[PDB]
Amino acid sequence: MIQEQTMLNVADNSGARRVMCIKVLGGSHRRYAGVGDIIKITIKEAIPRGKVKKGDVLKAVVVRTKKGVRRPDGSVIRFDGNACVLLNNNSEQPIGTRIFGPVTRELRSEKFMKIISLAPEV
Amino acid sequence: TSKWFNIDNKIVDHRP
Amino acid sequence: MIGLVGKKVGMTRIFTEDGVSIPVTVIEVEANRVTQVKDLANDGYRAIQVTTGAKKANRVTKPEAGHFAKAGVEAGRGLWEFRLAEGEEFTVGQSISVELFADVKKVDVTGTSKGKGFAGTVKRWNFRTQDATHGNSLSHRVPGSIGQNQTPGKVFKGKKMAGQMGNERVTVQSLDVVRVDAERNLLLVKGAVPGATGSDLIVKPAVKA
């Protein structure tokens, strides 16, 4: 459950550190993004070197939500915090090159393969 | 005497 | 085709080999015994009339009893009609088991919704709630304007307003049939049907694809 405003941590290099969701893309009036959805983003923190700089506007992939995820059977995965992987505005597709912290099976997408190939877990 | 709304200016003045 | 009358015992999962939780409402479906058949001759239409439960003798009235008398009695909870359509059934308490749905994939299901009794707007109609704050004077869950001005000079009919909510008919439709179990009188349909535990239910094969 991510929604406009809401700070997210970032799970890649690129160098964002802290980032804010300025839109839940994908539908009129769409309230929440979560799981492995896409959101428009404005960088709030940014390391000094880094691909991205503060004030940039990009997209990103929700990779960990505290409300977590369910899928079949009835179980739950919850993560302590909210994190995402920055995507280039045109091509989706991570601008980063390393992923940090575990990611979930749901992300097993054509476009998000590069994330689960990286990333040390689930 | 008079009810408070009648005495009060904002409600009473209403259309100048 | 026709359908049957049951009783919501209700709601539990069943797990599958490849590890998936299927939430199911558990409908107990004791045999339905046709109390009457109806025909274009004895005017109107083609329908059957079943009963299903069991009732206290001292509770069954003379008339109700006399009606049960024609055909195999044992008075049940109540009566229900199903319209027919080129299927046929003779009245001698024909008795219809959950057998009926062995091959059915669909099923519609109709209960009597839990009784909310009031609600008013917000609950009843999902009306928005006025500023909780910011100066609002005694108008936090109220309905706000309910008309225009002189020119309609009235409130239109069917205006969404506070009042009775639930404890009414409502059916659900679609609903995959998960399991059929005769000599147990069970029927597991996938998930959630209207009305409370214990209440009466009518299930029919779904009218929609």
Binding site: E121 | - | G10, T12, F15
Partner: protein
């Protein structure tokens, strides 16, 4: 719930060992990895438990690669397969939600050893 119950216990696992909040269990869950149907191990602290027959679940807290992750297994689910206890926890407290506010060295729980 008399006609239920029956439907339910005829699905319940019987091999499930006994654990207790605080224990450091490892749950080995099935996972269609991608092409392979393999086992995957989740090891962490039991922080809360169910106790509702067929619907029994429990929450295991892991602290992976920085910050925690919690998994609620429905205990009687096929996808679980194996579950062994691996360490005995001393807590006195049914739900260990307080651990969420701790971090590493501050979140260790004594052996129960009895």
């Amino acid at each position: 719930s008399n006609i239920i119950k029956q439907l339910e216990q005829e699905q319940m696992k019987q091999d499930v060992p006994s654990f207790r909040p605080g224990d450091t269990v490892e749950v080995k869950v099935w996972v269609v990895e991608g092409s392979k149907k393999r086992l995957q191990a989740f090891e962490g602290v039991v922080i809360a438990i169910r106790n509702r027959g067929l619907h029994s679940a429990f929450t295991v807290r892991k602290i992976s690669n920085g910050e925690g992750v919690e998994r609620v297994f429905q205990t009687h689910s096929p996808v679980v397969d194996s579950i062994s206890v691996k360490r005995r926890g001393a807590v006195r407290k049914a739900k260990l939600y307080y651990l969420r506010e701790r971090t590493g060295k501050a979140a260790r729980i004594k052996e129960r050893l009895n």
